Design a protein around this ligand. Structure first.
Ligand SMILES: [Fe+3]
Ligand SMILES: [Fe+3]
Ligand SMILES: [K+]
Ligand SMILES: [K+]
Lengths: 409, 409
């Protein structure tokens, strides 16, 4: 049992001063140090009066297998980016060996993230995710728009799903991902989602990431048309959007990106057990614009980085700074608070892990970070945490101090 | 004489490969290494094939005297920020002693900036600027809206101007700043600008930084009205905007911020010898929105950080990343190129220093930075320089390698 007394606790929803946190695997109590030592005489008190305690981040959406990318994939424009993934994945995947994956996951923990949603396309990241101290939801992604090869795509997905499922534990959950509404045949999506239903898996899907997708699925025209004709010899979209979206009605689904979603889609998703995953850097760098947060206000959202295939880091502090800037007209002190809540509590809710809040009964998944100097208004704390922090001093996962440095469960 | 052969040179306007740069104080030649050694047999060739050469940045607008600020001033809203400056400047100024100023200027050089525009309100930064290896335009700022005390404000400005002018050299130029159209009486502005005219000084002015300023100077109403009534016992704006703007017609002026400028003002400024200084982080963090670059396309602009009074760093790489994000719908590969040009060449043009370009006859004010790995499309270089760079490996000012580490002229 340990007691930490920081300058303040971000819960994240509230700022608590003059209290400490008692924790072992879970957060056991939040009270004055004097009260806590009466209850927990075996817990040494650690005073960190120049530090803040907040939950570990959840990063519910990243593509680990692409972690070798720095400047190989084409940024600025979504269809050219996609062509570059197809052209270069055979080079990039082998470059990210076990050392690349280990280093990447360690970097994630060292920057204060304690839970992730890993989108896995080939299963090459399985061993790294089961070894990692991070809590991982491991989304086995299926892709394929051609009915002729749907059996093969399903077989691959099924094998990967079962290969991952044998490793489940408190820090590893097997899950299902549908690549998108343009790239997965309806019948293949349905069969993969039947597996999710059978096993009670979380589901993730990229939905309305680009205007090209919007126009292709609405009209069968636009920038995707050349891509589908050239690469796939397809002349029209394989899925009706409404029919595809209906497949998710009985599942807990992460709808990722959502930049180009329309009002009907948003109303439908609001009626589901669903979260939106907002990836501001990835959307901006791939020429996809910015998610309008007011339009999706009926649906909870969380923040993620996407992979290094469309981002220059997996540091959630960097993602949160970018989020402040791509929504530049949102008043900064209040929006920083919203962002910190969405990056902790909301992301943990999206992943279904018990954490993301400094609250009794939650796993002690926590970050200890430097207190920004010269603070005059405690309400400004959330903004200054985003602006001045790059990495925590300590990171706890289930009460275990992993960054003190152990990166493996 | 030295020759450097990098992987590529950003001029900044063009990408040159397969050539090296010969330089002493100035850039002497740009040619193949084979040709350069024929011309400069005394210059050892340095091969840096995993690096890029680009000009040192200009940062034409910063408030050094406020470099102690981290979380003391109020962010999010401009009038509250201004109240906080008034409330806390007596605490913040003394905290930034010579060590604070020395460390700040050293940090500026270490992040690849080689020329600055220092806005000085009290002259407390004079010694640091004359000592610094940086090229500095030292803008002696005047403020005061009350006619009754204009004589005192002018006397202070004049003394500071003359105290700075005695130190002029290739790396230090004395200049004049007018705080703003709301805070400087017309007659005080005119008298300060007469000094600029007499001595041929550059001029800087904050212009249309906030909507409050826009409404106050258009209508005598809005958020500034409470401020002027309470702090200044003034009930209407002291200046007619058009009359105030006319004062700058014969000068070379840096118009800083410009977020809320109107079409008439922009047309007028376009007819002047004038540059706009774009400070995206400061504008965003103080609840002032984002400068519309399309509306000011008739006027050249440069990028600056403003002071640590409204920014979390003075690193131009960070400013450029923020610029990418606050203009999130500008295609990234082309906009990154625009930004690099505006941060080097345009800022040097604004400050009137000979530099900001890797071109024969220019001072060798240069940065050597890491080449981003795995590049497939050389045209993407500008974007990857902004995304992946935090500090250069080497920084040259007039050919002298200051970052290799010497911070003093
Ligand atoms: Fe993704
Ligand atoms: Fe300023
Ligand atoms: K794990
Ligand atoms: K100097």
């Amino acid at each position: 049992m340990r007691i930490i007394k920081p300058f303040a606790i971000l819960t994240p929803q509230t700022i608590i001063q003059d209290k400490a946190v008692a924790f072992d695997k879970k957060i056991e109590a939040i009270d004055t140090v004097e009260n806590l030592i009466k209850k927990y005489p075996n817990a040494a008190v650690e005073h960190d009066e120049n530090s803040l305690l907040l939950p570990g981040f959840a990063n519910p959406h990243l593509h680990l297998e692409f972690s070798a990318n720095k400047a190989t994939l084409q940024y600025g424009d979504f269809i050219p980016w996609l062509y570059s993934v197809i052209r270069h994945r055979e080079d990039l995947l082998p470059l990210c060996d076990g050392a690349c994956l280990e280093q990447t996951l360690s970097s994630i923990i060292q920057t204060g993230t304690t839970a992730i949603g890993a989108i896995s396309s080939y299963g090459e990241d399985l061993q790294a995710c089961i070894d990692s101290a991070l809590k991982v939801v491991y989304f086995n992604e299926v892709i394929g728009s051609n009915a002729a090869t749907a059996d093969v795509m399903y077989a691959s997905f099924l094998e990967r799903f079962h290969q991952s499922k044998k490793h489940e534990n408190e820090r590893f959950k097997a899950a299902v991902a549908i690549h998108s509404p343009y790239s997965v045949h309806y019948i293949l999506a349905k069969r993969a989602l039947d597996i999710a239903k059978k096993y009670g898996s979380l589901v993730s899907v990229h939905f309305m990431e680009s205007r090209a997708e919007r126009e292709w699925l609405d009209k069968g025209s636009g920038e995707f048309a050349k891509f589908f004709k050239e690469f796939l010899n397809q002349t029209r979209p394989v899925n009706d959007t409404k029919s595809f979206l209906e497949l998710f009605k009985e599942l807990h689904t992460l709808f990722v990106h959502m930049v180009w979603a329309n009002e009907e889609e948003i109303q439908t998703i609001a009626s589901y057990n669903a979260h939106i995953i907002h990836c501001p850097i990835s959307n901006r760098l791939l020429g996809n614009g910015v998610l309008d947060l007011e339009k999706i206000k009926s649906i909870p959202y969380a923040i993620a980085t996407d992979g290094l295939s469309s981002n220059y880091s997996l540091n959630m502090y960097e993602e949160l700074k970018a989020a402040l800037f791509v929504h530049p007209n949102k008043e900064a002190t209040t929006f920083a608070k919203e962002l910190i809540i969405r990056a902790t509590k909301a992301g943990y809710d999206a992943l279904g892990f018990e954490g993301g809040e400094i609250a009794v009964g939650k796993d002690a998944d926590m970050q200890l970070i430097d207190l920004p100097e010269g603070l005059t208004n405690v309400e400004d704390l959330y903004l200054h945490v985003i602006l001045h922090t790059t990495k925590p001093k300590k990171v706890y996962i289930q009460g275990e101090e992993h960054v003190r440095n152990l990166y493996f469960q």
